[PDB]
């Protein structure tokens, strides 16, 4: 069944599961042509496939060449997502294959279901949560590897850095979703908060700064404040 606020701690039990977000698979800029018509130009995209318990991220880069000569690209993006997710599962040893895959957008259920017909015991689930994984391209290192790619490529990351050495998966995921929620609502402010202090660096093998525990508390409060202000502004409350 669907994932929602009620059954939220199921994400951190010991049944392997992955989130799949397809929002950044098919990406375009829109521009005017010489004759004054509108045209699109695709840029490189990515599938965001994340194990919320361990932080393992399977970033499958979608090179613009995929789209060459294809029609109905937004529809095709969903099937390509499901093709690549299905290939990822096939590539994993049996004991690493997920028991559930949760898609962040309902339009992915049928494509993934059809591509996973070989795995009848992997459940494909929608979610009622409004997860901010579209903001993944606001993480500089992820955006950089997507835009530099010259061919299809799978890049692996731990989206939690080393946080799990000190905090639980539940807490780690709440931090991640808060950071991404903030990046989504006001990228410039969010990014200002994260880097303001030049003396807190991002390790070469990390995505986020090496904040101490106490600095994470200040950061998280600053992201909360950012998110609430933007809301009052959006709705005049």
């Amino acid at each position: 069944g669907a994932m929602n606020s009620s059954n939220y701690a199921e994400l951190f039990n010991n049944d392997i599961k992955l989130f799949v977000d397809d929002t950044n698979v098919y990406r375009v800029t829109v521009h005017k042509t010489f004759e004054g018509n509108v045209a699109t130009k695709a840029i490189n995209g990515c599938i965001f496939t994340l194990n919320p318990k361990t932080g393992h991220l399977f970033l499958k880069i979608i090179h613009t060449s995929v789209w060459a000569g294809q029609k109905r690209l937004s529809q095709l993006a969903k099937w390509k997502t499901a093709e690549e997710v299905s290939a990822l599962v096939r590539s994993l040893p049996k004991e690493e294959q997920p028991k559930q895959i949760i898609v962040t957008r309902k339009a992915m259920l049928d494509p993934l279901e059809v591509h996973m017909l070989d795995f009848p015991n992997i459940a494909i689930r929608p979610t009622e949560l409004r997860l901010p994984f579209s903001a993944a391209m606001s993480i500089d290192k992820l955006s950089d590897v997507v835009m530099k790619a010259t061919e299809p490529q799978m890049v692996l990351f731990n989206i939690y850095d080393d946080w799990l050495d000190r905090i639980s998966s539940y807490t780690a995921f709440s931090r991640l979703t808060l950071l991404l929620r903030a990046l989504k609502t006001n990228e410039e402010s969010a990014k200002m908060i994260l880097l303001s202090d030049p003396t807190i660096t991002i390790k070469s093998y990390h995505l986020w700064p090496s904040f101490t525990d106490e600095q994470w508390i200040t950061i998280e409060s600053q992201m909360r404040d950012l998110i609430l202000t933007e809301y009052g502004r959006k709705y005049n409350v």
Binding site: L76, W79, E83, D110, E113, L117
Partner: protein, 300 residues
């Protein structure tokens, strides 16, 4: 012209024969139905005055034997039976006619309705969907479930329609996931028509039989099956032209004959709207689209 005599009518019941029906009172001297047109299947069906639940009935073809109805007070229902003694049967049928205790199959000569609803329905195929090979006729009722329904409990009493499932390996070739899901032509034409049904006439015959079971008994799994077989055709980009023209005629007469008050449960909004307005064959059902719009515009 053939006859189905009735031994008696001990309980108040509404009897139907094909699209006609007659009220019969408890211990009224009703002794059968005569002048039944040879050359088609037929169905004789029942709904007791006391239980407006469990409509039930028997599919038969008079060329396959002499059949009659008898009430069973143990099992509480009108049963169809075969009389093997040909002379003993003409004898019953002639005495009852002489006494004029039989209704006449009330066919208008201008009317091809029953032909149009049963054009591809063959008794031999019915007996494979309703397996009970000691009788030449087939019992169906409101409550019987289909083989596909069972999979998601007594198989002796099942409707063994052909299982259709758009999200199955059968329906989807490995490597053509997207193509086959969006254009079911390979499932329709290679798997179903060439593979299983062998020809479109057997396919149309099961489709029509599923509709009739849904109409006459309110059998819900039959309604599911009728809709699935329409959707498979409408969701195929490549369909023989003869199938599309014949489908339009088939569906027209089915929609024409449906009781107006039942369109809510018997007609699946999503399928019809997709077939008539979104599918590859949106433009190929001109008569069916015209009667649906004028008779059930609400559903659309």
């Amino acid at each position: 012209m053939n006859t189905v005599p009735f031994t008696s009518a001990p309980i108040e019941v509404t009897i139907g024969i094909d699209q006609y029906s007659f009220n019969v009172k408890e211990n009224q001297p009703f002794h059968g139905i005569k002048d039944i047109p040879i050359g088609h299947v037929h169905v004789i069906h029942f709904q007791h005055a006391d239980n407006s639940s469990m409509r039930y009935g028997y599919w038969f073809d008079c060329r396959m034997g002499n059949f009659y109805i008898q009430y069973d007070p143990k099992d509480g229902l009108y049963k169809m039976m075969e009389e093997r003694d040909g002379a003993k049967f003409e004898n019953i049928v002639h005495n009852f006619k002489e006494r004029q205790m039989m209704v006449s199959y009330p066919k208008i000569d201008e009317d091809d309705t029953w032909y149009n609803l049963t054009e591809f329905v063959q008794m031999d195929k019915i007996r494979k969907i309703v397996r009970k090979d000691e009788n030449q006729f087939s019992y169906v009722d409101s409550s019987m479930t289909t083989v596909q329904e069972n999979e998601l409990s007594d198989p002796a009493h099942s409707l063994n329609y052909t299982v259709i499932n758009f999200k199955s390996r059968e329906a989807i070739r490995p490597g053509h996931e997207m193509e086959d899901f969006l254009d079911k032509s390979y499932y329709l034409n290679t798997v179903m028509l060439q593979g299983i049904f062998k020809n479109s006439s057997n396919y149309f015959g099961e489709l029509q039989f599923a509709f009739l079971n849904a109409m006459f008994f309110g059998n819900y799994g039959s309604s599911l099956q009728w809709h699935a077989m329409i959707e498979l055709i409408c969701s195929s980009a490549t369909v023989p032209k003869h199938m599309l023209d014949k489908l339009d005629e088939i569906l027209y007469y089915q929609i024409k004959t449906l009781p107006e008050q039942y369109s809510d449960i018997l007609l699946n909004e999503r399928v019809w709207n997709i077939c008539l307005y979104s599918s590859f064959q949106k433009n190929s059902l001109h008569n069916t689209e015209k009667i649906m719009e004028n008779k059930y515009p609400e559903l659309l």
